[PDB]
């Protein structure tokens, strides 16, 4: 069974401010962190943005969350986007103001990460996992860290990894590199190979390799491919692995892509979510060093589709009541 099993609950306060109230399956209202712990979750993933336009997901914002997550006995997984806004394969926007030369940008990434981690340390919050970037498959901090700029990338990650290493955090969190399409091994292989062959980013600079695994972005995302990809990654670089992002809809009237053949039998419902989340967990667990699974934004009711072509990927009622499927975190 999985060592790390949780959800990314970053939107929680934005939702509370919007008037949302959460309840477990029985209708008992309480702060989300407790409904989560109640269902077997043992860790929350939180996204961190540099200078968000409205302050959400910034350091202060994430510290209030962490403190809360800790009170409910949940572990912490800090997810740096190293951007003012959403960072993903098609968007890695360097924070306005940051440097334009690799040495200074890297230095900045270091000071930023360093100070940020020390922010939790000084606050008495323990960070368990830290991803230096978010789905950085096409690199990060563009233009400099854009893919094929392999040198700059390994250069940037090394600095970021050390911002963590040199912080007051103790124990130090596992450093993770997060790429999307974990089912695509050629991508996982191409990326790490090119980054690790540069020299600046060393094997001892990171501990985990996290991957996003979704069913609605390509019929190619088969459980088998993820299974194979993870095994290939582990056997090749010996790092702990984990699915840091995944969803399953309870409603998907207009999918943009055909779902993988292995899950076309799984229903869009609370039952189907359980089935899917459990299958994905089995894949990760089957892999030696397969250590974690995180469902992305299960409680963002005011954004149900969660940026996908599916209508609802939440594990909550439109009114905020936890669905039965949320307790799948006990079984994994």
Ligand X SMILES: *[C@@H]1O[C@H](CO)[C@@H](O)[C@H](O)[C@H]1NC(C)=O
- DSSP string over 267-287: -SSHHHHHHHHHHHHHHHHHS
Per the DSSP assignment, residues forming a β-bridge with 93 are 142
| 99 contacts ligand X (rule: CB under 6 A) | yes
> In the complex, what is the shortest distance from the CB of residue 115 to ligand X, in angstroms, rounded to a whole number?
8
| 119 contacts ligand X (rule: CB under 6 A) | no
**Is 33 a known active-site residue?**
no
Per 3-state DSSP, the chain is made up of helix, strand and coil in percentages (nearest 5) of 40, 15, 45
The residue among 99 and 267 lying less far from ligand X, judged by its C-beta, is: 99
The residue among 116 and 313 lying less far from ligand X, judged by its C-beta, is: 116
Site for ligand X in 239-298 (CB under 6 A): none
**Is 135 a known active-site residue?**
yes
> In the complex, what is the shortest distance from the CB of residue 176 to ligand X, in angstroms, rounded to a whole number?
24
- Alpha-carbon distance of 68 to 87, in angstroms, equals 25
- The C-alpha angle with vertex 72 and arms to 326 and 37, in degrees rounded to 5, equals 15
- Alpha-carbon distance of 296 to 66, in angstroms, equals 17
Structure tokens at 99: 């440097």
The residue among 128 and 166 lying less far from ligand X, judged by its C-beta, is: 166
Determine the interface stretch with ligand X among 101-109, 134-142, 223-231, 243-251 (rule: CB under 6 A).
101-109
> In the complex, what is the shortest distance from the CB of residue 112 to ligand X, in angstroms, rounded to a whole number?
8
| 108 contacts ligand X (rule: CB under 6 A) | yes
- Alpha-carbon distance of 31 to 272, in angstroms, equals 26
| 111 contacts ligand X (rule: CB under 6 A) | yes
Catalytic, out of 15, 33, 135, 240: 135
- Alpha-carbon distance of 269 to 276, in angstroms, equals 10
Catalytic, out of 15, 240, 245, 297: 245
Judge if the upstream peptide bond of residue 76 is cis by omega within 30 degrees of 0. Answer: no
Q: Which residue has the tokens 């090119």?
A: 194
The residue among 31 and 99 lying less far from ligand X, judged by its C-beta, is: 99
Residue least distant from ligand X (Cβ): 111
Catalytic positions: 135, 245
Q: Which stretches of the chain bind ligand X, using CB under 6 A?
A: 99, 104, 107-108, 111
């Amino acid at each position: 069974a999985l060592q790390y099993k949780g959800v990314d609950w970053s939107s929680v306060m934005v939702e509370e401010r919007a008037g949302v109230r959460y309840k477990n399956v029985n209708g008992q209202e309480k702060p989300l962190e407790y409904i989560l712990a109640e269902n077997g979750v043992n860790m929350v993933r939180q996204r961190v943005w540099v200078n968000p336009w409205d302050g959400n997901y910034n350091l202060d914002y994430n510290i209030q969350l962490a403190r809360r997550a800790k009170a409910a006995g949940l572990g912490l997984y800090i997810n740096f986007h190293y951007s003012d806004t959403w960072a993903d394969p098609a968007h890695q926007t360097t924070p306005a103001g940051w440097p334009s030369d690799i040495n200074n940008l890297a230095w900045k990434l270091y000071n930023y990460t360093l100070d940020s981690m020390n922010r939790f340390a000084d606050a008495g919050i323990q960070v368990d996992i830290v991803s230096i970037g978010n789905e950085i498959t096409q690199g990060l901090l563009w233009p400099l860290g854009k893919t094929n700029n392999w040198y700059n990338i390994a250069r940037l990650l090394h600095s970021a990894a050390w911002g963590v290493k040199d912080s007051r955090l103790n124990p130090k969190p596992k450093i993770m590199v997060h790429l999307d399409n974990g089912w695509n091994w050629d991508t996982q292989n191409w990326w790490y190979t090119n980054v690790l062959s540069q020299g600046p980013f060393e094997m001892s600079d990171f501990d985990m390799m996290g991957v996003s695994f979704y069913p609605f972005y390509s019929a190619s995302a088969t459980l088998d491919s993820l299974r194979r990809s993870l095994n290939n990654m582990v056997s090749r670089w010996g790092k702990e692995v984990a699915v840091v992002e995944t969803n399953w809809p309870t409603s998907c009237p207009y999918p943009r892509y055909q779902f993988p053949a292995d899950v076309r039998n799984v229903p869009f419902s609370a039952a189907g979510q359980t089935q899917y989340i459990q299958s994905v967990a089995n894949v990760v667990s089957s892999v030696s060093k397969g250590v974690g699974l995180f469902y992305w934004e299960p409680a963002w009711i005011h954004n149900a589709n969660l940026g996908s072509s599916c209508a609802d990927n939440t594990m909550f009622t439109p009114s905020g009541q936890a669905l039965s499927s949320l307790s799948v975190f006990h079984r994994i």
